[PDB]
Ligand binder design. Structure first.
Ligand SMILES: NC(=O)[C@H]1CCCN(C(=O)Nc2cccc3c2S(=O)(=O)CCC3)C1
Ligand SMILES: [Zn+2]
Length: 139
């Protein structure tokens, strides 16, 4: 679990979004596993605006942060679940690292701010949904 709070927005994995998230829906994209809902309280997370390929993510299944090198956002394949049919997923970045289902939502950050959130895992790889292109989160 986990979310990014920036301005009056809350960014979560679309597969983990709550009823309250869907009732205050701003935008969602099933192909990116992202959902953004509106909030009443002001958020203070800073979103990175960069092409960094190194950063640190939080891994709840180890209560630890790990430094990683990660790929550029791209279209990658993902197997089925109670949540999605087998399909690709866009704006996804992979890194070599530990992840488990409950790890989705963990933040990946670089020196510039928040880069994205854990969205996929398996086979010793972890995948992050990128949020750096969502320029409207800041306005
Ligand atoms: N973005 C997606 O389509 C997600 C939706 C939830 C299911 N998906 C996952 O990758 N889950 C997940 C997350 C992190 C680590 C692991 C897993 S697992 O594949 O369920 C088992 C291996 C460890 C795809
Ligand atoms: Zn950066």
């Amino acid at each position: 679990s986990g979310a990014i709070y920036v301005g009056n927005y809350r960014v979560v994995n679309r597969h983990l979004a709550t009823h309250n998230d869907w009732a205050n829906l701003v935008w969602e994209d099933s192909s990116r596993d992202l959902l953004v809902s509106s909030t009443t309280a002001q958020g203070c997370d800073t979103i990175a605006r960069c092409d960094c390929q190194t950063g640190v993510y939080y891994c709840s299944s180890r209560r630890k942060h790990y430094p990683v090198s990660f790929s550029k956002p791209s279209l990658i394949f993902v197997e089925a679940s109670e949540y999605y049919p087998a399909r690709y997923q866009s704006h996804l970045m992979l890194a070599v690292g530990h992840s488990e289902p409950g790890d989705c939502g963990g933040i990946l950050r670089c020196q510039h701010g928040v880069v994205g959130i854990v969205s996929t895992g398996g086979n010793g790889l972890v995948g992050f949904a990128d949020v750096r292109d969502l320029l409207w989160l800041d306005e």
